[PDB]
Structures are given as structure tokens and as C-alpha cells.
Design a protein around this ligand. Structure first.
Ligand SMILES: CC(=O)N[C@@H]1[C@@H](O)[C@H](O)[C@@H](CO)O[C@H]1O
Ligand SMILES: CC(=O)N[C@@H]1[C@@H](O)[C@H](O)[C@@H](CO)O[C@H]1O
Ligand SMILES: CC(=O)N[C@@H]1[C@@H](O)[C@H](O)[C@@H](CO)O[C@H]1O
Ligand SMILES: CC(=O)N[C@@H]1[C@@H](O)[C@H](O)[C@@H](CO)O[C@H]1O
Ligand SMILES: CC(=O)N[C@@H]1[C@@H](O)[C@H](O)[C@@H](CO)O[C@H]1O
Ligand SMILES: CC(=O)N[C@@H]1[C@@H](O)[C@H](O)[C@@H](CO)O[C@H]1O
Lengths: 181, 590
């Protein structure tokens, strides 16, 4: 049931909610204005016509103009500190926007961690995001800082904001493992 | 409760509060430079004032922790830079007087203005008025006028201001536990507390003198060749065995001999390599040029550019929608932000400038993991030397033949090699005696070895002796010719441009040897050579965390600045120059 994906305010990318199912994707993608459908190691035709041991759909809100940072191989701020795609299994990254006939909750704006590093007397260690995990700055995002203490020092989180459009633009990272249609 | 722990937590707090403020100041300055308005400049000044106030407040707070008790090298090195009081040592009246003197000197240089009585409304300033005369004109009288007017209308009025500036700077330096201001400037190369890697402040003078003594034969041969070539352009103005007039050196001060290439080209029939037409015909925009530079750096082994570099950095002139100061600069804004600001045009000079500025950013991405105070080059000459070696390989015809910018059937012969080497030596070898001379003069004017009544006599004696340059018209002691230069009148050390030139060929020889390059060193590119990129990165990633001697040894295997790599680079030209000077006099008569 993909109702929580379509019902409720979409979270920010750093606070993405993962929905694991252990289906009719034609209907699910019919009511989103799919702008980009980048499928890795799997055809865009076979994702809805194959049985899977386990299916995961990570969904979060992220602007379309900033989607170049979530592309594979991107590095630096906003590219490795919010979410990292897991390429161990075949993936399908979908950048879409819900259609007008469907109602979606609209958050205040788009928020993401531009850079979550650990500064101190011995330097700044970047706390990059592991594939499928969070940024360690999730609870202090987008902008904040705490005192870990010791060699690490201060956990500094630097965020960014963007004025969101008339409708939310949401990213879906679909991952399957080797759930029948 | 230990002093070490107190210093460590103080530096923790300082680094936490300095990354945000420095990033805010950098963002404000970048917004000003990218788009000049009245609000953006005011935001820039507010951010700079806040950053300076924070820096002063943390510097006064830093003196509580003594250096002798701190054991960690990182903490000690951060505290060293934090407790440098500087102008704060001087009293409020003295500090205000020094700042005012610097401000008037800088404004006098910036608004330098020249006009003959024949047209008081047709006045010419330095940029680009007199620069064009000094760089392009071929008239002895016109260049002499543009030289004397600039050194008698601007330099003549900086003399008492420069004397007071020297007095105040010596006061500040000696009150800061230095011998004089020259010792304070040389303190950048000082290393203490590291066994086998120590460097003294006074050792820099001896090393620079020794390296210049080793440079001198090549410079003398190049000077003789340039004098012989200029004798054909000014038949009745240059003596065969004498010095070179100061106004016939291709620019105002003779800092670079680049604009003398047209007169001193060895083989004018054979044209130099220029791939501008190739990129015009292949439709190479700014994005393609910078992606080619990124491909070069990745092939070397260094990381590719960040995504934010490709969206937050503007590489083309925005037009009239927003005025922009697009002098090509690299920007380490802090907090992982790197941006190149330049008006890229389809030209080989802008193609090599892309590699040059790309190499400045790579150093920043390398040491971005260092503490804020240690995020710099090992010394003041490391950063620009690292930048300058990336354009050495980029301009190599092998690199141009690998990216398709040069015809694969292009005939690289000895004539083109000599032309390229002469062009390189005009800008590189010709600026070393000038830099050494200027820094020596400043060093022992600050030291008090030259009385204020002997400033202009000693300066021109240095010009005739070290550089072989004779003044067109004698100058008594109201002029300030050194102050006619930007760095002298704007309080900038000049030796960074000497050591860099010796570091740049030290790295290139070390990297090429790591690249298993066979043949002349000037025909070397470090492309597709990970063994050279690793050696470069092992020094780049350190920052100021390790002594510049150790950082040098990490690449070149030697602890000290050396000149043999520089002389090896110009070896094909040195033999050709020696053959060309068999029937001429090498050296100048004073
Ligand atoms: C030219 C360049 O730097 N490409 C990079 C490199 O990491 C790799 O070629 C690929 C990653 O799979 O895409 C980019 O991230
Ligand atoms: C074209 C454009 O968007 N300019 C913006 C705008 O905020 C304003 O015109 C000015 C600041 O007041 O400079 C930039 O920040
Ligand atoms: C550690 C150290 O040398 N501090 C000096 C010293 O003259 C004094 O502690 C203070 C000036 O009042 O600040 C510095 O100039
Ligand atoms: C380069 C250096 O001096 N490192 C030391 C070392 O004790 C350790 O690497 C770390 C603390 O765990 O930071 C410094 O205290
Ligand atoms: C340094 C110099 O004299 N260059 C000349 C000059 O006429 C101009 O700079 C350009 C012509 O476009 O190239 C050369 O002919
Ligand atoms: C400098 C160099 O050796 N480059 C080689 C060359 O085969 C070509 O320039 C290109 C092929 O794509 O990249 C490398 O393989």
C-alpha cells in the first residue's frame, strides 16, 4: 500500500522515510508528473512486471532544479550529505510531481543539509552519507551544531533553503532485491 | 585542567566560530565581485568588519595559552598564527597613523594620473593608459616620457609617506620581537621545533643569494641576447657592453620581459603554437575548456570538481545584466565551497588559465580537512607554484595533441622548442633578478643598512649591478621608484615570486621523474601519470600542518629550495643562447 507515500507531507531529503514492502506501479506513477526516470541495472519496463524478494521505495521532497546533486557520481556539498543512492541492487530514481487531481500536503520550503562536517582543533572531517543511511546531522538539520567533545569537537551542520514551487517536487528511489505484481 | 586541554578546547571553539564567519565573509565578497551594487559592497564591508573583530578578539584571547607548554604540533601551530599581534602592538595613535599612511599610499597608486600641459583633459592613468605605452610602443622618447612621468608624478609624492610607513612598520616589528619588518616578512619561512626540518629567518637571505648566484649565468646570457636584439630596435640608445634602459623592458618597471618577445623572437618565420583557431572551429565554449581542465586533473589522479563548483561558479561574462570583476581567481569560500571566477574567452591563454586556476582549487580541496588556520600552502610560495605547474604541462604540445587541439602531424622541431623556451625565459628567468633585487633593497632598507638619504642611490646601484638595468635619466632623492610598483606601495612581500619560481620547476622535475618522462623536461606533461598525482597530493593535503621543508621533501626529495630543476628546464635554450652569444659580450658594465 503506497498510501503513506501519497498521503501526508513529504519529508525533507535528510529526513527521508523508507517504505519497505515484502502491486500496480502503472497506477502509482500515473498520478505523478514523472520528469526523470533513471533506472540503473534494470529496465524501466521490467520494474512493474517482476517478482521481488523485497521492495523498498525511498521518498522525500527535493526541488527539480537541485536534482543534479542526487545524480550518481556527484560529489561535494548537497551531493553526499543528504542522501546517497544504493547501487548494490538495481535501482530506479524517479523525480516527479503529484498531479493536480491528487491532493498533496505542501511543506514550508525545501530544506537540505548543504554540509554536515565535524570541526574542531584538529580539522574538519566530513560526515558523508552511507548508501541507505542518514547523515548523522538528521536531528540538527538543516543548520545547527552540537558539542560531541574530544578530538572530534563540534558537529557542524550547514543547511540550505529554496522557495518551493506551487506544487511539491518529490524524489522516489526504488530498490528491489532478488513482491509480485 | 591542563594547559594543553584548555588550549585544545579554546581552538575547538575558535574553529567552530571561525568556519561560519569566514564563510559568511567569503559569500559576501563573492556576491560583491560577481554582481557589483551598493548593497552588496556594504554587505561585504559588514562581513569583513565582523570577521576582523572576531579575529582580533580571538587573538587577544589566544595569548593566555603559552607556546612552551603546548606539546601537540597542530595546537602549537594554530596558536602561533593566533597570537601574532601585529599592528595591535602599536598604540592607537600609531595604528591609526599607519593605517592612514597605507590608505593614502594605496589611493595614490590606484589613482595615478598623468597628462602633459598640452591637454589637461586627456589625462592618462596606469591601467590601461601607460601600460599600453610601456607594453606596445616602440618609441624611445614616448616610453621615456611614460616612464619619467609615472615615476615623478606618483613616486615623487609617495616618498615621505613611504618613509613614515617604514618607520612605523619597523616600530611595530621590533615591538613584536623581530629584528625589523624584513625579519617579520621572512618569518613565513621560519620552521622551529622539528628535528632535521628547521629553517631560520636569516637562512632565507643566504639561500636566495646562493640560488641567484647559481641562476646568474643563464640570466646574463639571456640579458646579452635581449640587449643585442634591442640594439636593432634602438640603434643609438643601447651600448653593446652596457646595461639595458629601464623603459625598454616591455613594461613599466621591467618586472617581466614578456612584451619583448616580438623584438627578441629567435625564429620569426616559424609561428608559435596557438590552438585558439582549433577551439574556434571545434566550438569550444567555457564549459568545454573547464571540463578539459578537469579531465586533465582527473587523468593525473586528482579528484574531479564538485557539483557545487559547476553551479555556483560562473565561468562566462554575465553581460550588462550585472557588472562583474572577472580577473581570473580561485575561491575557497570555506565549508566545502570552491568557485572559479573568470571571463573565459576562446583563447589559448584562457585555456591555460583554466588549468592554472583549476590547480589552485585542487590545493584547497586537498587541504580542506585541515584546521582553518592551517588551510594554506606550506609557505607563501607553494600555492602559486602549484598553480603554475599545471599550465606548464597544459601548454605542452603532447597534451595539445592528445585532446585534439593540435594536429597530430604537427612538426615539433628544435626551432619551435627554442622559440617556446625563449618566450618562457622572458617571463620566468627575466623576473628573478628583478624580484631578488627588490626584496634585497626592501630587506636592508627595513634593516637600516640604507639611510633615507641613500635610498634612490642604492636602489639604482642595485638595478645596474644585480639586474643590469640603467636609469634613462638620473634621479635624486625625492623620487620613490620602488613605490611606483603595486606591491611596494601596497605592503606586499615580493620574495614569494622568487621561491615560487624555484618551487615550480622543482615540482615539475619531481613529477615528470615520477611520470617516467623521457626527453627534455620542457616537453613534459604529467597527464595519465597517477604516480605523479599521488606525490603531488601527498604534499597538497598537508596544508600548513607540516613544515614547508618537509612538504618540499615529500615531492622533490630535498628539504631546501633548489635551482638545478630550473636550469634543467632551460637547458636547450642555455646552449642555444651560449652559441648565439659567441660573438657578443656577456655581462654588463657599470
Ligand atoms: C570525468 C569524471 O570525473 N567522472 C566522474 C568519475 O568519478 C567517474 O568517471 C564516474 C563515476 O562513475 O562519473 C563521475 O563521477
Ligand atoms: C537580478 C537579481 O536577481 N538581483 C538580486 C536581487 O536581490 C537584487 O537585484 C540585488 C540585491 O538587491 O542583487 C541580487 O541579489
Ligand atoms: C605571549 C606574548 O608574547 N604576549 C605579548 C606580550 O607583550 C603581552 O602578553 C601582550 C601585550 O600586552 O601581548 C603580546 O604582545
Ligand atoms: C598529527 C598529530 O599531532 N595528531 C595527534 C595525535 O595524538 C592524534 O592523531 C590526534 C588525537 O587523537 O590528534 C593529535 O593530538
Ligand atoms: C606585443 C606586440 O607588439 N603585439 C603586436 C601588436 O600589433 C598587437 O598586440 C597584436 C596584433 O593584434 O600582435 C602583434 O602584432
Ligand atoms: C595523454 C594521453 O596519453 N591520453 C591518452 C590518449 O589515448 C588519448 O588522449 C585519450 C583517449 O581517450 O586518453 C588517453 O588514453
Amino acid at each position: 500500500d503506497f498510501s503513506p507515500l501519497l498521503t501526508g507531507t513529504p519529508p525533507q531529503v535528510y529526513n527521508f522515510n523508507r517504505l519497505s514492502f515484502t502491486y500496480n506501479l502503472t497506477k502509482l506513477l500515473s498520478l505523478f508528473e514523472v520528469s526523470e526516470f533513471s533506472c540503473n541495472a534494470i529496465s524501466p519496463s521490467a520494474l512493474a512486471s517482476t517478482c521481488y524478494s523485497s521492495l523498498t521505495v525511498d521518498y522525500f521532497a527535493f526541488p527539480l532544479s537541485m536534482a543534479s546533486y542526487l545524480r550518481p557520481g556527484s560529489t561535494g556539498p548537497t551531493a553526499e550529505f543528504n542522501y546517497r543512492q544504493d547501487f548494490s541492487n538495481p535501482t530506479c530514481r524517479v523525480l516527479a510531481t503529484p498531479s493536480s487531481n491528487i491532493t498533496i500536503t505542501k511543506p514550508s520550503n525545501y530544506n537540505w543539509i548543504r554540509l554536515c562536517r565535524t570541526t574542531g582543533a584538529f580539522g574538519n572531517r566530513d560526515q558523508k552519507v552511507q548508501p541507505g543511511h542518514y547523515s548523522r546531522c538528521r536531528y540538527i538539520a538543516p543548520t545547527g551544531s552540537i558539542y560531541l567533545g574530544g578530538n572530534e569537537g563540534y558537529l557542524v551542520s550547514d543547511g540550505q533553503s529554496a522557495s518551493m514551487t506551487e506544487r511539491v517536487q518529490m524524489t522516489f528511489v526504488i530498490s528491489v532485491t532478488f513482491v509480485c505484481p | 585542567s591542563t594547559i594543553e586541554e584548555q588550549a585544545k578546547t579554546f581552538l575547538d571553539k575558535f574553529n567552530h566560530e571561525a568556519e561560519d564567519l569566514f564563510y559568511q565573509s567569503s559569500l559576501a565578497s563573492w556576491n560583491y565581485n560577481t554582481n557589483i551594487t551598493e548593497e552588496n559592497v556594504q554587505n561585504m564591508n559588514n562581513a569583513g568588519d565582523k570577521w576582523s573583530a572576531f579575529l582580533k578578539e580571538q587573538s587577544t584571547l589566544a595569548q593566555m595559552y603559552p607556546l612552551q607548554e603546548i606539546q601537540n604540533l597542530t595546537v602549537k601551530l594554530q596558536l602561533q598564527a593566533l597570537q601574532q599581534n601585529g599592528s595591535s602592538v602599536l598604540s592607537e595613535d600609531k595604528s591609526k597613523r599607519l593605517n592612514t599612511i597605507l590608505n593614502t599610499m594605496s589611493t595614490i597608486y590606484s589613482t595615478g594620473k598623468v597628462c602633459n600641459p598640452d591637454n589637461p583633459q586627456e589625462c592618462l592613468l596606469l591601467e590601461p593608459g601607460l601600460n599600453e605605452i610601456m607594453a606596445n610602443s616602440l618609441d624611445y622618447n614616448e616610453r621615456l616620457w611614460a616612464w619619467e612621468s609615472w615615476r615623478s608624478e606618483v613616486g615623487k609624492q609617495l616618498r615621505p609617506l613611504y618613509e613614515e610607513y617604514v618607520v612605523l612598520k619597523n616600530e611595530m616589528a621590533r615591538a613584536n620581537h623581530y629584528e625589523d619588518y624584513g625579519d617579520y616578512w621572512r618569518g613565513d619561512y621560519e620552521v622551529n621545533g622539528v628535528d632535521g626540518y628547521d629553517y631560520s629567518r636569516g637562512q632565507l637571505i643566504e639561500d636566495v643569494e646562493h640560488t641567484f648566484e647559481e641562476i646568474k649565468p643563464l640570466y646574463e646570457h639571456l640579458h646579452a641576447y635581449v640587449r643585442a636584439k634591442l640594439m636593432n630596435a634602438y640603434p643609438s640608445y643601447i651600448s653593446p657592453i652596457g646595461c639595458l634602459p629601464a623603459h625598454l623592458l616591455g613594461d613599466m618597471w621591467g618586472r617581466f620581459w614578456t612584451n619583448l618577445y616580438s623584438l627578441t623572437v629567435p625564429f620569426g618565420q616559424k609561428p608559435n603554437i596557438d590552438v585558439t583557431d582549433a577551439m574556434v572551429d571545434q566550438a569550444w565554449d567555457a564549459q568545454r575548456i573547464f571540463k578539459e581542465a578537469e579531465k586533465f586533473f582527473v587523468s593525473v589522479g586528482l579528484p574531479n570538481m564538485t557539483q557545487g563548483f559547476w553551479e555556483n561558479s560562473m565561468l562566462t561574462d554575465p553581460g550588462n545584466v550585472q557588472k562583474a570583476v572577472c580577473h581570473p581567481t580561485a575561491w575557497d569560500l570555506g565549508k566545502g565551497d570552491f568557485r572559479i571566477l573568470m571571463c573565459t574567452k576562446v583563447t589559448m591563454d584562457d585555456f591555460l588559465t583554466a588549468h592554472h586556476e583549476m590547480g589552485h582549487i585542487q590545493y584547497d580541496m586537498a587541504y580542506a580537512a585541515q584546521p582553518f588556520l592551517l588551510r594554506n600552502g606550506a609557505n607563501e610560495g607553494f600555492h602559486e607554484a602549484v598553480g603554475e605547474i599545471m599550465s606548464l604541462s597544459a601548454a605542452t604540445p603532447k597534451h595539445l595533441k592528445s585532446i585534439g587541439l593540435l594536429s597530430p602531424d604537427f612538426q615539433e622541431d628544435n626551432e619551435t622548442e627554442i622559440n617556446f623556451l625563449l618566450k618562457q625565459a622572458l617571463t620566468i628567468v627575466g623576473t628573478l633578478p628583478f624580484t631578488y633585487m627588490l626584496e634585497k633593497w626592501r630587506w636592508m632598507v627595513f634593516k637600516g643598512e640604507i639611510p633615507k638619504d641613500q635610498w634612490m642611490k642604492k636602489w639604482w646601484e642595485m638595478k645596474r649591478e644585480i639586474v643590469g638595468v640603467v636609469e634613462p635619466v638620473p634621479h635624486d632623492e625625492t623620487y620613490c621608484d620602488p613605490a611606483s610598483l603595486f606591491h611596494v606601495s601596497n605592503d606586499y612581500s615580493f620574495i614569494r615570486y622568487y621561491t615560487r619560481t624555484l618551487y615550480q620547476f622543482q615540482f615539475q622535475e619531481a613529477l615528470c621523474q615520477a611520470a617516467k618522462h623521457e626527453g627534455p623536461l620542457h616537453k613534459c606533461d604529467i597527464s595519465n601519470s597517477t604516480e605523479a598525482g599521488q606525490k603531488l597530493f601527498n604534499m597538497l593535503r598537508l596544508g600548513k600542518s607540516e613544515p614547508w621543508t618537509l612538504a618540499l621533501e615529500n615531492v622533490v626529495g630535498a628539504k631546501n629550495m633548489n635551482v638545478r630543476p630550473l636550469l634543467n628546464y632551460f637547458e636547450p635554450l642555455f646552449t642555444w643562447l651560449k652559441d648565439q652569444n659567441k660573438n657578443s659580450f656577456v655581462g654588463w658594465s657599470t
